[PDB]
Amino acid sequence: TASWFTALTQHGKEDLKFPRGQGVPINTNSSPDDQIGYYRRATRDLSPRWYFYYLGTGPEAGLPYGANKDGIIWVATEGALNTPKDHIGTRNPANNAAIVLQLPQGTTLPKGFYA
Amino acid sequence: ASWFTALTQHGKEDLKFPRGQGVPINTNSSPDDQIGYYRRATRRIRGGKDLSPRWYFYYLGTGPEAGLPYGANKDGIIWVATEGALNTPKDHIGTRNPANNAAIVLQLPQGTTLPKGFYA
Amino acid sequence: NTASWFTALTQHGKEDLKFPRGQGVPINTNSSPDDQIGYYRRATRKDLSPRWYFYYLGTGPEAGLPYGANKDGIIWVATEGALNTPKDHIGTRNPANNAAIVLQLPQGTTLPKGFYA
Amino acid sequence: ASWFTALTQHGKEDLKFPRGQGVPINTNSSPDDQIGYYRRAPRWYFYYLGTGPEAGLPYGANKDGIIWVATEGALNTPKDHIGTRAIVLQLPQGTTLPKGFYA
Ligand SMILES: [Zn+2]
Ligand SMILES: [Zn+2]
Ligand SMILES: [Zn+2]
Ligand SMILES: [Zn+2]
Numbered sequence: 222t223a224s225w226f227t228a229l230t231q232h233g234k235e236d237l238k239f240p241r242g243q244g245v246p247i248n249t250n251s252s253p254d255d256q257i258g259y260y261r262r263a264t265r266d267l268s269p270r271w272y273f274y275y276l277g278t279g280p281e282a283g284l285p286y287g288a289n290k291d292g293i294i295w296v297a298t299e300g301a302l303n304t305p306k307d308h309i310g311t312r313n314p315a316n317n318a319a320i321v322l323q324l325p326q327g328t329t330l331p332k333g334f335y336a
Numbered sequence: 337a338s339w340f341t342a343l344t345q346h347g348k349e350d351l352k353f354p355r356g357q358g359v360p361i362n363t364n365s366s367p368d369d370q371i372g373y374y375r376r377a378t379r380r381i382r383g384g385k386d387l388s389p390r391w392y393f394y395y396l397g398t399g400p401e402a403g404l405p406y407g408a409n410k411d412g413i414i415w416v417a418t419e420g421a422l423n424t425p426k427d428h429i430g431t432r433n434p435a436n437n438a439a440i441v442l443q444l445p446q447g448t449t450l451p452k453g454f455y456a
Numbered sequence: 457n458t459a460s461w462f463t464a465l466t467q468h469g470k471e472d473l474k475f476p477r478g479q480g481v482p483i484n485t486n487s488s489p490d491d492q493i494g495y496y497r498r499a500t501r502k503d504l505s506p507r508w509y510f511y512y513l514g515t516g517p518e519a520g521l522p523y524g525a526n527k528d529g530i531i532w533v534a535t536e537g538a539l540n541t542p543k544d545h546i547g548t549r550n551p552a553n554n555a556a557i558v559l560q561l562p563q564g565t566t567l568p569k570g571f572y573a
Numbered sequence: 574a575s576w577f578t579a580l581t582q583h584g585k586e587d588l589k590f591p592r593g594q595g596v597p598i599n600t601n602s603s604p605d606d607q608i609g610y611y612r613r614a615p616r617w618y619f620y621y622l623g624t625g626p627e628a629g630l631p632y633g634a635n636k637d638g639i640i641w642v643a644t645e646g647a648l649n650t651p652k653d654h655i656g657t658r659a660i661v662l663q664l665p666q667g668t669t670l671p672k673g674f675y676a
Pocket of ligand 3 (some may be wrong): 487488
């Protein structure tokens with residue numbers, strides 16, 4: 222599969238993390254109930270790259286929201302529904318290019334993350 | 337493909353706009369170009385299920401339904417048009433390169449009456 | 457058509473394209489003031505809205521026309537301080553190597569009816 | 574295979590920048606990434622350090638047709654996460670450009 226958004230690149234030691242309510246990329250064409258998913262760390266070492274996938278999609282579709290697993294953090298905006306977002310799924314690189322991952326301003330990023 | 341991202345339908349209500357609303361915002365287009373159709377594309381998850389439909393906007397005379405004139409009744413096709421726009425084919429805008437170029441986020445003027453389950 | 461560095465100016469109205477002297481050269485920040493001179497060539501493909509493509513002086517389909525030469529479908533533009541020399545170091549665009557640059561005109565450029573930027 | 578438009582060379586004075594200046598503006602990039610090189614073909618294409626046709630070249634390598642630029646605070650690391658894809662080559666207001674270069 223492939224993430225619908227671009228990657229947040231890690232530069233320092235601090236892994237990616239977000240306070241509750243923040244972290245979900247901006248996607249004005251999706252419902253408020255969809256604003257829930259996870260970031261997955263992919264290390265090639267190199268600069269770690271965290272790719273966002275909606276709940277129930279991506280390499281960790283079977284995991285419930287909040288399932289503790291290394292390289293997987295969870296985010297959910299106030300008002301989302303704990304349901305698999307099958308109607309979004311993942312992106313196909315041959316069909317769609319990645320969306321520039323943007324976050325609402327006032328979002329707290331760790332040292333070494335920029336958006 | 338469409339120049340704009342799809343309006344996904346999260347409810348039972350199909351997409352519809354009052355006259356004068358519904359045309360996406362595109363700064364690289366003239367007022368004579370603010371007219372076109374939305375086309376519904378429905379898919380199935382086949383999870384042991386009809387997924388939420390997505391509506392793609394295409395300009396008049398472009399896209400899959402490039403031959404349909406304005407106002408043409410057809411299932412899965414609705415028509416939007418800003419006042420002052422011209423009822424002519426618009427090949428100078430045409431369609432988009434999906435995986436080659438980029439998709440434009442479908443925006444609408446503040447105050448556009450969106451049905452339930454549509455967001456922008 | 458397409459062989460130009462810039463996107464087209466589409467004529468949505470009846471009036472042909474024209475500019476007052478000193479206007480009409482597309483914004484190209486990485487180019488000398490001596491380069492700000494060239495012409496627009498109308499391309500027509502029921503008829504569709506005509507599309508006007510910009511080519512620098514001494515380039516494009518009319519690379520042999522001197523500046524100011526009268527020819528239907530060719531209007532001339534030039535910014536204050538441009539040299540009347542062929543811009544051979546700029547040339548045309550190869551769509552296989554470079555994409556077109558969105559045509560932008562300075563704020564306050566006088567445009568005829570049916571021309572937008 | 575660059576990201577920014579090339580700085581066209583008008584004349585024969587090759588492209589060069591003082592220390593701290595020369596890196597094109599990229600709002601989609603971190604301050605640690607503001608380092609790279611320009612490759613000549615004439616046009617000068619910018620490539621972030623470790624990407625493009627001269628990826629394996631270390632910063633400061635003295636090869637013909639390659640100049641090095643870097644912003645204050647940048648890290649001498651390969652910027653592979655940026656890679657190679659246009660974007661108008663935009664420099665901060667006040668960048669000392671040689672004769673025959675315009676931005
Ligand atoms: Zn949705
Ligand atoms: Zn138009
Ligand atoms: Zn020049
Ligand atoms: Zn970076």
